[PDB]
């Protein structure tokens, strides 16, 4: 039987407050912007944050190609991967990711600041990265947000 | 061209691409690398 009578309430699928926000990447640093984006996606800015529920915001990033990498990171940061075959290690750069597309670079950075579980694998799908300032997300009425305020 | 841990100096000491060189165009047998 329950002798507590004063509990903390967890949010659930029917009680979360999910919103669409738009942030800009005009001159921000890649890691410093992506940490704030990870906090937005996880829902650390909501007073009803619940670590076992998708309670964050759907984030649209515009002007993704204007992001800034300081130092020699654009070609001096060596990402390594493996194909699974002998002699199968490969190298690539943030420049290679940017050439492929800005969404791939942003997804790679944000996955790594997100939790490593099923919930984080679900959360990463709430992020939308676009190269220019033109995107098509009507019927949801996204709200502009100043990322420098956060 | 000779590469050695300690290079020393009309030869002139220059730094190129993070490496140390001692060059002498008058006498090319005195070039050195990796100071």
């Amino acid at each position: 039987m329950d002798t507590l009578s004063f509990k903390t309430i967890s949010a659930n699928k029917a009680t979360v407050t999910k919103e669409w926000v738009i942030v800009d990447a005009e001159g921000q640093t890649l890691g410093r912007m992506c940490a704030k984006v990870a906090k937005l996606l996880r829902g650390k800015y909501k007073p009803n944050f619940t670590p076992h529920v998708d309670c964050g915001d759907n984030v649209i990033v515009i002007n993704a190609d204007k992001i800034v990498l300081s130092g020699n990171k654009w070609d001096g940061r060596i990402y390594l991967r493996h194909t699974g075959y002998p002699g199968g290690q490969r190298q690539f750069t943030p420049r290679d990711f940017m050439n492929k597309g800005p969404e791939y670079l942003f997804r790679k950075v944000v996955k790594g600041m997100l939790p490593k579980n099923r919930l984080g694998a679900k959360i990463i799908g709430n992020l939308y990265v676009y190269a220019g300032t033109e995107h098509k997300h009507e019927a949801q009425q996204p709200r502009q947000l100043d990322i420098n305020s956060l | 061209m000779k590469v050695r841990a300690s290079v020393k100096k009309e030869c002139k000491i220059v730094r190129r691409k993070g490496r140390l060189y001692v060059i002498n165009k008058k006498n090319p047998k005195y070039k050195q690398r990796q100071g």
């Binding site: 039987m1 002798t3 507590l4 009578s5 004063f6 | -």
Partner: protein, 104 residues
């Protein structure tokens, strides 16, 4: 109207006629009137007062419904592997149930 007040060393949010369980109060009877006057916050349907040295004049009067409510049994187990040491006890926490009559 709700107040934030502590009862037996734990802060609770309480309204009128709530039927709380609190830590055991010794030497009480059914229907006995208990008093708790250490309110930290009062929220009167819009007007909120916060007390550093508590809220002056605030007060919660309750009546005891059950003088001894035991909680669910918990098994307490100690074991150190490969050493042979092992013991298993039982524990039941002790509560009293009160009903809040007036919230001043």
């Amino acid at each position: 109207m709700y107040v934030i007040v502590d009862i037996q060393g734990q802060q609770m949010k309480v309204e009128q006629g709530r039927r709380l369980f609190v830590h055991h109060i010794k030497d009480v009877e059914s229907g006995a009137s208990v008093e708790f006057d250490k309110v930290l916050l009062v929220d009167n349907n819009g007007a909120i007062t916060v007390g550093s040295p508590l809220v002056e004049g605030a007060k919660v009067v309750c009546e005891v419904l059950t003088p001894l409510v035991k909680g669910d049994k918990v098994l307490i187990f100690h074991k150190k592997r490969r050493k042979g040491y092992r013991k298993l006890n039982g524990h039941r926490q002790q509560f009293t149930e009160i009903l809040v009559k007036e919230v001043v």
